[PDB]
Amino acid sequence: NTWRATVQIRQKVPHKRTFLFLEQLILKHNAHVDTISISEAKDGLDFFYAQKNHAVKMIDFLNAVVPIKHKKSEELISQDTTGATYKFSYSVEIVPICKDDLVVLPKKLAKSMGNISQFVLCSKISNTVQFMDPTTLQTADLSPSVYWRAPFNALADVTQLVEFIVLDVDSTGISRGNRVLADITVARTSDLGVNDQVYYVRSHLGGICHAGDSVMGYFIANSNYNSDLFDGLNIDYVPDVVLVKKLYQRKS
Amino acid sequence: NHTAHNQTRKAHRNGIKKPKTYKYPSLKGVDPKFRRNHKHALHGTAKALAAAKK
Amino acid sequence: VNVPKTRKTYCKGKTCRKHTQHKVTQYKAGKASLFAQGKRRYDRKQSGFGGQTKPVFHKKAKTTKKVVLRLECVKCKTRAQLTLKRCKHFELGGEKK
RNA sequence: CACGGACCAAGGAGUCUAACGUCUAUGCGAGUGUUUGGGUGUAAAACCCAUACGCGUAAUGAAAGUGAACGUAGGUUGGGGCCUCGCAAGAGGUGCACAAUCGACCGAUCCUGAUGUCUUCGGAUGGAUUUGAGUAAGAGCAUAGCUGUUGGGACCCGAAAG
RNA sequence: GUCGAAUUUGGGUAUAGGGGCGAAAGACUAAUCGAACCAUCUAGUAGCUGGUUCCUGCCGAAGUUUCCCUCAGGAUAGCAGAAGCUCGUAUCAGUUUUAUGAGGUAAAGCGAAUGAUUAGAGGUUCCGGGGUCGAAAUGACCUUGACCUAUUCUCAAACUUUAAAUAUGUAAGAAGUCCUUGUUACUUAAUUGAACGUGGACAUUUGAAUGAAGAGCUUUUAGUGGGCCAUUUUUGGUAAGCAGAACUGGCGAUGCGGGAUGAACCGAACGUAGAGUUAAGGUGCCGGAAUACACGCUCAUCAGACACCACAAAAGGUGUUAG
RNA sequence: GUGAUUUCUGCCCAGUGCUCUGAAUGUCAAAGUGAAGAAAUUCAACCAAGCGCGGGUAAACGGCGGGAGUUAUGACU
RNA sequence: GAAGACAUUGUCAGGUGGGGAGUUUGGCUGGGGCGGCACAUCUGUUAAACGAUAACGCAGAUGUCCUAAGGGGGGCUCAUGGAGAACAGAAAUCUCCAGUAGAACAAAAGGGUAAAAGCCCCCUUGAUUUUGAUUUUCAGUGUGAAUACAAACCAUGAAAGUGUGGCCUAUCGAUCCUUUAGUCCCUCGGAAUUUGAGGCUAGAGGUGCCAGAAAAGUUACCACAGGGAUAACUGGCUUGUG
RNA sequence: GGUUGCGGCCAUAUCUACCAGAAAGCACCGUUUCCCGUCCGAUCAACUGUAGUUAAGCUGGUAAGAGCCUGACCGAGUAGUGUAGUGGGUGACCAUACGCGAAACUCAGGUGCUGCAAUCU
User: Fold this and answer.
1) For residues A82-97, b (16+ Cβ closer than 10 Å) or e, as one string?
2) Which of residues 15-34 of B touch strand E (CB under 7 A)?
3) Which GO terms describe its biological process (chain A)?
4) Residue A194 and residue A192: Cα distance in Å, rounded?
5) Which residues of A have a CB under 8 Å from any CB of C?
6) Which of A57, A69, A131, C30 is the most buried if burial means most Cβ atoms within 10 Å?
7) What is the C-alpha separation between A53 and A190, in angstroms, rounded?
8) Are C1 and C17 in contact (CB under 8 A)?
9) Which chain C residues 33-72 have CB under 7 A to strand G?
């Protein structure tokens, strides 16, 4: 009973990307000073804070860098008999939508945020969650006050990315800050050797993409998606390839 | 929660009897190639004990 | 995943009694036909002191999809299916592996 | 040191009915049930009665439909009782109910496709690790009784609410 | 407190229940207000408390299994009563013996393999698991480190060659054994096998011991589905009148004799009575019964007196006794 | 909404509200129109307000941090 | 005077709408809440030598992956250690001896495997059709998973055989409604034809609270029906010496 | 009795070291046209039993060897355990009554047995 107050951090996703971002940022600003100990969990880690006010001061730090939700309870011990003083617990939950997911948004939710299409990627994850349309570049933000009233899931994790090989890049010529809408022509790693089946897709990977270069991407065709929000889409409007990022083997 | 106390004393009030092992056990579950022959084997030997020995 | 569009499977059809060649498509909904028997105590007894009768579904942790591999025989053309698994997308034809 | 009880008389709580399950009694028995109604009466009693209808004598199928004996209504293993034999013990013959098992028949499903045939109908015969709440010298119907179930205020007294 | 004014008051008159009225307290609206009073639908519903009326006879439980938004409750299975039915030595048994099976805990084993633990000192293309970045990839910044690099000794519920006890499966025959040859569409090169039989032989020691207030079978329904205690084997907890299990007995449902007293310990389980002997316990007196016998020990300025049980530790003491 | 007077009332229109003499073809009900069909029907364009994009507003709800770079700083960046 | 085929009014349709009405706001639990899944399952242990056997006991896994990592057949032997070979070394390729598995078998853990169940090649779809019987959890119901056959057609091998999915133990789902595939079968009940609709038989929409409700808060203004108390004794517990 | 073919039980049959094997049989060895398979006629295929061999293989014998397997008034009636008491002890735990009964170790002895067919101084 020496702990006397606790912050409980959890993220439900099996590959915790934003949560590993939290542990390196907390070491940088040295926010963990008043810790009694650190105990791991199945889904995250626990912080045991001796005085109440130090536990609250972490949550003011947690609001600035990561989208959270929190609530508190209490427990009863032994009441020094000066008129009086309960043992508290703070349960902080990170938004599970990672930095580089694929997301099918709800229709009513997507209609408000700039009338973006339902089939977008994740962008930046900051304090607020940012979504980017990969085909025609347009950004939209989701705050935790809007997310937690109607929660949903990501459509694919990091472990569904597929190695591709870029054939050539054609720049259409419209951009904000990302050399946007390069009409990339790209083919699979498995089918470049023995086949000619070539995929043809716009992407945000404009300036950082070159010919003879390996990119990772979400592949909607063979892979098995199961979302009800995805099911109420128009299947002949969904792009086949969503180009995500690049490997770029730097040095040996 | 769970305990097995008094559970042996309940079952040994009416005892533990055997399933009493009848003559002519049922051929359901015996091999069907054998059952198809053994249908005809009893048929001839009931005819043969009808006319010959009487 | 992937399945073929063409499939040599069994026929039970008073003439074939053998395996003939069959054709594959997917699962499509055309109008649910409320000559179906449960939609005119709806269009009877909805319209009432009693009001909107039939309940809906909401507890939507539901996930999967009906994935149809049909066997359209090129020889006789009638109707008894084949099965798949708990599966999430289904395209057919391309990406032979 | 949990709750109710100061004392006395009176009142005071598993009832009734509709439909039913097992068991038991009685009538009649491949039938059974007079009483919705009519006839008569000493008059809400008793007595007498036609035509139907109910349940039963036939199942099975989602249905159109078809619809139960190769035979001393079958073979084997036990089976009370009676018959024969023996002074008896026992041996031998017939063996009801009922228990086990292999068959046969009818309906369903899958198969076999005869004489024929408006050339597409018709379904003879033969099958099968299948399936039925069946046939295989009928047993049900009606009234009453205790026990039990369901719907009723339902063993009596009790809310905060609408 | 205020007391010539936003003062005090009579009568008239207006606003009515999800409505009114409020210099705002959720106040007031006929002793009723976080939604008035009256009658009716209403004997509203209740897995929750309380109560439930005559006697005697016989039999006699359960707090456990699976399933339920299920844990104060129900269905189902078990336990129990009743009505009985076909027969009457039936073949069964909370048991032993013989003949064989199975097991891997106690003990043994570590100079017969495995085997932790506590702490960790440096190794920039011997990795890269990851983080943010970046109009790129000769690309930076970071962290657990990729690596134990040449260390030792010690064990274990998730180590083993060998392997008790106690519990446990099966057999000890009439539906069985042998001789002779019938059936078939299966099986074999083959009427050879297989399976089932006809006919013949084998008899009360007919195939170990002991017992059998008959054995076999079916319908139908009540209550119960909050359990606790003890010895022994144990897990969690320093340790609990603590938390959870295992086999058997008991209390609950059960008095009587003994432990002064006591739900669980010891003896023993109940028709009404008489005589007889005993159990556990006791025999100075209360208090029925030997101030019986026999060998010793012990003196306390808080002696000691009978299992469960209501008391105690190490270590000291020329106090005493026997070694 | 604040609560006499005196004296002051800073910065922010991203968020949520509110608002508009603002661009228009993204969304888009019934009726209507067109096409195919033997007909019931099916499909297609068309499409109001509102939503969406754009502008205004804090005596509207409200907010007023961190990292650096030379070490105390109402410093500059 | 003003206004005019617009306004108003009637009917249907879309938007807005806590101002108002109705209702819900899981369970287990060393009090409830938070965390967690002990709620559906699997391996080792707890577990005391059949089986069974509890705890919010312990160390861990599953909501997948695979036309080969399934089926058959043939050839071959692995981790590692030792001795030798231009560059070549702590680790490239080649060679030989020793080599009971110290390797590998998609993954947790425990079993299993040496002319194989490993490794490298060869041909293939039995990962098929009809439905019964059995084992596990168990009421001897369901569901999942599995075992041994029967009737068909096949694959491989010279052959015996083997194969009804992953070497064994886990990897998954009812009624209702939906939709597709076999007879082109049955019916639309006055009689026909064609669309349409309803049926039988086998399967996929799925409830993860997993034998399967459509569901956010607060009450210190609170109400009702009930249930729990209260402290001062573990087994003798408490004292002066890390 | 010695070999060969096919085996059963699967170390008393293995492992390490040396030593012997008349006979017949297995084996090493000879060759590359055909069938076939490789980088390589070494394995595998075919052809010859002709040119040559017991050097190996295999078989047998030995070693105060390692191992394994049977035996023990060996360890030891010890450890452990079923049942019993108003038995002991503050406890830890230990005695006694009726029962069951190990193991490593120590020592002694052992080193394949055998079924069918055939061929051999």
Assistant:
1) eeeeeeebbebbbbbb
2) 15-18, 20-23, 33-34
3) protein transport; ribosomal large subunit export from nucleus
4) 6
5) 220-226, 228, 231
6) A131
7) 57
8) no
9) 33, 35-38, 55-59, 61-68, 70-72
State the CB neighbour count (10 A cutoff) for residue A52: 15
Q: Name the residue with tokens 């408000």.
A: A112
Cα B40 to Cα A4, B29, B48: the distances in Å are 86, 18, 13
Chain B touching partners, 3 or more CB pairs below 8 A: none
Direct distance between the N- and C-terminal alpha carbons of chain C, in angstroms, rounded to an integer: 10
CB contact set of A54 (below 8 Å; sequence gap of 6+): A5, A33, A34
Interface contact A224-C89, CB threshold 8 A: yes
Question: What SS3 state is found at A239?
Answer: coil
Amino acid at C59: K
User: Strands A198-203 and A139-142, how do they pair?
Assistant: unpaired
- DSSP helix, strand, coil percent of chain A (3-state; round to 5): 20, 30, 50
For residue C46, give every residue at least 6 positions away whose Cβ sits within 8 Å of its Cβ, in sequence order, or none.
Answer: C52, C53, C54
Rounded Cα distance between A99 and A126, Å, is 9
CA distance readout (Å), A225 to A15, A222, C96: 18, 9, 19
Instruction: Sort A43 into a burial class: Cβ within 10 Å, 0-12 / 13-18 / 19+.
Output: middle
List the determination method.
cryo-EM
